[PDB]
Design an enzyme around this catalytic site. Structure first.
Site, PDB file in Angstrom:
ATOM      1  N   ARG A   7     -27.738  -6.627  31.525  1.00 49.11           N
ATOM      2  CA  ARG A   7     -28.385  -6.612  30.731  1.00 49.11           C
ATOM      3  C   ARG A   7     -28.855  -7.113  30.524  1.00 49.11           C
ATOM      4  O   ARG A   7     -28.470  -8.651  30.284  1.00 49.11           O
ATOM      5  CB  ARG A   7     -27.324  -5.979  29.406  1.00 49.11           C
ATOM      6  CG  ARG A   7     -28.638  -5.587  28.226  1.00 49.11           C
ATOM      7  CD  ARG A   7     -26.997  -5.121  26.591  1.00 49.11           C
ATOM      8  NE  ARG A   7     -27.556  -6.221  25.837  1.00 49.11           N
ATOM      9  CZ  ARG A   7     -28.300  -4.383  24.519  1.00 49.11           C
ATOM     10  NH1 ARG A   7     -29.004  -3.184  26.017  1.00 49.11           N
ATOM     11  NH2 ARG A   7     -29.648  -4.360  23.928  1.00 49.11           N
ATOM     12  N   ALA A   8     -30.374  -7.995  29.899  1.00 44.85           N
ATOM     13  CA  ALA A   8     -31.043  -8.773  29.913  1.00 44.85           C
ATOM     14  C   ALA A   8     -30.716  -8.055  28.011  1.00 44.85           C
ATOM     15  O   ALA A   8     -31.430  -7.550  27.356  1.00 44.85           O
ATOM     16  CB  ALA A   8     -32.747  -8.622  29.687  1.00 44.85           C
ATOM     17  N   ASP A   9     -31.033  -9.370  27.110  1.00 43.37           N
ATOM     18  CA  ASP A   9     -30.577  -9.432  25.804  1.00 43.37           C
ATOM     19  C   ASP A   9     -31.060 -11.061  25.411  1.00 43.37           C
ATOM     20  O   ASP A   9     -30.398 -11.636  25.964  1.00 43.37           O
ATOM     21  CB  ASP A   9     -29.649  -9.490  25.326  1.00 43.37           C
ATOM     22  CG  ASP A   9     -29.027  -8.156  24.653  1.00 43.37           C
ATOM     23  OD1 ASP A   9     -29.338  -8.685  23.543  1.00 43.37           O
ATOM     24  OD2 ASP A   9     -28.811  -7.605  24.246  1.00 43.37           O
ATOM     25  N   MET A  23     -23.038  -5.921  21.438  1.00 42.77           N
ATOM     26  CA  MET A  23     -22.907  -4.572  20.188  1.00 42.77           C
ATOM     27  C   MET A  23     -24.101  -4.041  20.416  1.00 42.77           C
ATOM     28  O   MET A  23     -25.312  -4.032  20.024  1.00 42.77           O
ATOM     29  CB  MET A  23     -22.946  -5.438  18.059  1.00 42.77           C
ATOM     30  CG  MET A  23     -20.973  -5.982  17.954  1.00 42.77           C
ATOM     31  SD  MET A  23     -20.094  -4.829  18.934  1.00 42.77           S
ATOM     32  CE  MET A  23     -19.849  -5.880  19.814  1.00 42.77           C
ATOM     33  N   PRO A  24     -24.410  -2.818  19.464  1.00 44.93           N
ATOM     34  CA  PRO A  24     -24.886  -1.695  19.266  1.00 44.93           C
ATOM     35  C   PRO A  24     -26.192  -1.766  17.575  1.00 44.93           C
ATOM     36  O   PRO A  24     -25.044  -3.303  17.391  1.00 44.93           O
ATOM     37  CB  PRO A  24     -24.264  -0.809  18.963  1.00 44.93           C
ATOM     38  CG  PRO A  24     -22.983  -0.730  19.807  1.00 44.93           C
ATOM     39  CD  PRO A  24     -23.011  -2.050  19.186  1.00 44.93           C
ATOM     40  N   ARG A  25     -27.188  -1.791  17.452  1.00 42.67           N
ATOM     41  CA  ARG A  25     -27.614  -2.388  16.521  1.00 42.67           C
ATOM     42  C   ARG A  25     -27.123  -1.859  14.735  1.00 42.67           C
ATOM     43  O   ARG A  25     -26.639  -1.026  15.214  1.00 42.67           O
ATOM     44  CB  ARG A  25     -29.496  -1.516  16.768  1.00 42.67           C
ATOM     45  CG  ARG A  25     -30.200  -2.113  15.948  1.00 42.67           C
ATOM     46  CD  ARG A  25     -31.623  -0.778  15.541  1.00 42.67           C
ATOM     47  NE  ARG A  25     -32.364  -0.791  16.656  1.00 42.67           N
ATOM     48  CZ  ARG A  25     -33.201  -1.804  16.281  1.00 42.67           C
ATOM     49  NH1 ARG A  25     -32.834  -2.408  15.790  1.00 42.67           N
ATOM     50  NH2 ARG A  25     -34.277  -1.548  17.291  1.00 42.67           N
ATOM     51  N   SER A  60     -26.907  -0.366  26.359  1.00 44.68           N
ATOM     52  CA  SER A  60     -27.855   0.339  27.588  1.00 44.68           C
ATOM     53  C   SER A  60     -27.200  -1.119  29.000  1.00 44.68           C
ATOM     54  O   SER A  60     -27.783  -1.735  28.794  1.00 44.68           O
ATOM     55  CB  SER A  60     -28.580   0.710  27.233  1.00 44.68           C
ATOM     56  OG  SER A  60     -29.629   1.122  28.916  1.00 44.68           O
ATOM     57  N   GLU A 109     -34.862   4.484  35.730  1.00 50.13           N
ATOM     58  CA  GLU A 109     -34.224   3.686  34.501  1.00 50.13           C
ATOM     59  C   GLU A 109     -32.314   3.295  35.062  1.00 50.13           C
ATOM     60  O   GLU A 109     -31.700   2.964  35.318  1.00 50.13           O
ATOM     61  CB  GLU A 109     -34.017   4.114  33.409  1.00 50.13           C
ATOM     62  CG  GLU A 109     -35.945   4.157  33.165  1.00 50.13           C
ATOM     63  CD  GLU A 109     -36.260   2.695  33.304  1.00 50.13           C
ATOM     64  OE1 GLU A 109     -35.943   1.466  33.420  1.00 50.13           O
ATOM     65  OE2 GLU A 109     -37.786   2.924  34.592  1.00 50.13           O
ATOM     66  N   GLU A 111     -29.636   3.986  34.136  1.00 47.71           N
ATOM     67  CA  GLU A 111     -28.897   3.527  32.590  1.00 47.71           C
ATOM     68  C   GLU A 111     -27.577   3.855  32.679  1.00 47.71           C
ATOM     69  O   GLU A 111     -27.128   5.359  33.337  1.00 47.71           O
ATOM     70  CB  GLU A 111     -29.307   3.397  31.741  1.00 47.71           C
ATOM     71  CG  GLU A 111     -30.897   2.161  31.189  1.00 47.71           C
ATOM     72  CD  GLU A 111     -31.398   2.635  29.961  1.00 47.71           C
ATOM     73  OE1 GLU A 111     -31.032   3.707  29.691  1.00 47.71           O
ATOM     74  OE2 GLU A 111     -32.644   2.797  29.694  1.00 47.71           O
TER      75      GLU A 111
END
Ligand code: GAL
Ligand code: NA
Lengths: 232, 103, 102, 103, 103, 103
Positions: A7-9, A23-25, A60, A109, A111
């Site tokens: 995952r890019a972050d 974490m989720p938003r 994701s 995608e 995912e």
């Protein structure tokens, strides 16, 4: 097995560690369940991408480094520095195409999404990406546990159909396989807010149970220093 | 001095190596008088004890018995794979003398 | 008083530094009489012991031998990378004197 | 010697097994004078103590009482499911003699 | 009695507060005779020891020295952020008197 | 025998309950002579100690003081929610007599 997800972050490793993971938003800590966010896979999968999908209680990932990089270049262009996190498979992860079937909104995608986010211990490591260029060096995460996570896989779709999170009126709940797993108030159940409340509570219960397993693995290792006799 | 559990076991009478290559299925611990012990099982039903300390143990073993109960409790909780157990088989259940964890 | 494990090692006869930069591969522990010890290995096959307490140890070392065995168990179960071991090399397996983790 | 908690518990009068199959809901410990003890509860209200060490215990139990309190703290913090507790039912709260954890 | 590490440190001569707000970079421990100590390092180069027990210590400090090495070990292993250390600045490496952890 | 911390607290004259329902914000520990103690704080500023062992403690409390310092360190590191503290309030910081943990 030892399969990895990616995952890019833009959130850096120090923040990930303070947060207990990716974490989720809206969620600032993994185990700190004081304010309980919405958990809904359908809503999550349909979310819009300057962030890789992380709303509605899931985060994701992609199935390869190249795929996650290409996504990073599409979505995180204009962060001079970002990270691609390398993530172990474990039964908090759902194959979105499998669980949502023909209703998966972005099936190309491919995912895989983590219910409740990705705990720090499930993070193998991270690459730095500077002006779109992947640094060759993988930074390894000390919080990771290889023997533990390499003995686990993603959740089977049968564990996710009941959490798919379709609206009560969605035809999925009247089709196989979901019809066999529909929450109360959904689908052909009488007068199908119960469906959404039950999706939520089922997700919370899943996460509670999953979190107990993480705590057990990580916090038992943290207590493997105790020597009884030295105090006795 | 032995370099591994198999060679250590060979030094003792009435001893046997069980190859488990599995995590512990259950851990039981007792503080009841004269039964201050631990018992572990594996999913295939294999059952082992850490003996109640007594005069079959030399003084130097007392600390090590306590260590082994610490090790088994936390191996169970971390789901650590146990490779082999060295045990005495002149007891029922077999009594643990040594443990190796790998993989 | 030494500031690191290399300088500490140099204060003793019959020692050497092994640089591993790797997690422990196996952890073995025994309560058997006269063999109350721990043995660890690394994936390259390097093997090391924490000795049975004996006449080669002064009293101040007894608590430290127990601490070392505790450290090796937690390091094994948390997959901590060990940087170096200082050992006495006149024992087989080589006997741990100090550990560093980084 | 017993091979499980049920058989171990059976060796003592005034005991019984509680089957919980659940994590500990709350953990309480005390260093107050004459109340040096631990108390645990489960979500259904069931409450259990590790007794203050006293003349009802033999010397060999002392070390096991301390171990048990550690086991309960560890179990609590890790949310480990406790399978069964062997307890003395002539105390209130019921007093822990043994614990089993499985899986 | 002090409310925090800074007020504690001030009760002593030849002490000072170091502020790291960082995890420990390295942890070293030794059982060699006369060098039963621990040494920690931070990524900025800062190095501290837990002194070998000696004539500079009163009896009530012996258990605390053992506890401190345990604390440093688990702080290192868990990557806990260390806030401050109180140390004696008349030893090389500087000798730890107290630690505070906080995020 | 008390069944919870509030009831235990009520058996002592110079104690009170504090209700936190929060994780520990900072953990501080000292080996310095005469200040072999631990201090915890919570994010609202509430500050508590585990006292240096002294003439006010009976022999049975000595091990329990050490256990409580163990408990608070691991509670800190695991971010476990503290429900209530029972404290002696004729000391500053308030001195911990017992702890309850629950989510
Ligand atoms: O048992 C510990 C307690 O002992 C009392 O005598 C003292 O007044 C309290 O502050 C507390 O220290
Ligand atoms: Na996996």
């Amino acid at each position: 097995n030892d399969d990895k997800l990616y995952r890019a972050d833009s959130r850096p490793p120090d923040e990930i560690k303070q947060s207990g993971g990716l974490m989720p938003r809206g969620q600032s800590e993994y185990f700190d369940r004081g304010t309980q966010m919405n958990i809904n896979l359908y809503d999550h999968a349909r979310g819009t991408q300057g962030f890789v999908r992380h709303d509605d209680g899931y985060v994701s990932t992609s199935i390869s480094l190249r795929s996650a990089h290409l996504v990073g270049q599409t979505i995180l262009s204009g962060h001079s520095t970002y990270y691609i996190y390398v993530i172990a498979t474990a039964p908090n992860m759902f194959n979105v195409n499998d669980v949502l079937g023909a209703y998966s909104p972005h099936p190309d995608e491919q995912e895989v999404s983590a219910l409740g986010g990705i705990p720090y211990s499930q993070i193998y490591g991270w690459y730095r990406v500077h002006f779109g260029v992947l640094d060759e060096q993988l930074h390894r995460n000390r919080g990771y546990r290889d023997r533990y996570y390499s003995n686990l896989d993603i959740a089977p779709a049968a564990d996710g159909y009941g959490l798919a999170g379709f609206p009560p009126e969605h035809r999925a709940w009247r089709e196989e396989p979901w019809i066999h797993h529909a929450p109360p108030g959904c689908g052909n159940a009488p007068r199908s807010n119960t469906c959404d409340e039950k999706t939520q509570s089922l997700g919370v219960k899943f996460l509670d149970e999953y979190q107990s397993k993480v705590k057990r693995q990580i916090f038992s290792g943290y207590q493997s220093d105790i020597d009884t006799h030295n105090r006795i | 001095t032995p370099q591994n559990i198999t060679d250590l076991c060979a030094e003792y009478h009435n001893t046997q190596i069980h190859t488990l290559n599995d995590k512990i299925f259950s851990y039981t611990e007792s503080l009841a008088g004269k039964r201050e012990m631990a018992i572990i099982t594996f999913k295939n039903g294999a059952t082992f004890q850490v003996e109640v300390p007594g005069s079959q143990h030399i003084d130097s073993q007392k600390k090590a018995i306590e260590r082994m109960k610490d090790t088994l409790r936390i191996a169970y909780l971390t789901e650590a794979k146990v490779e082999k157990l060295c045990v005495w088989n002149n007891k029922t259940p077999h009594a643990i003398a040594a443990i190796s964890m790998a993989n």
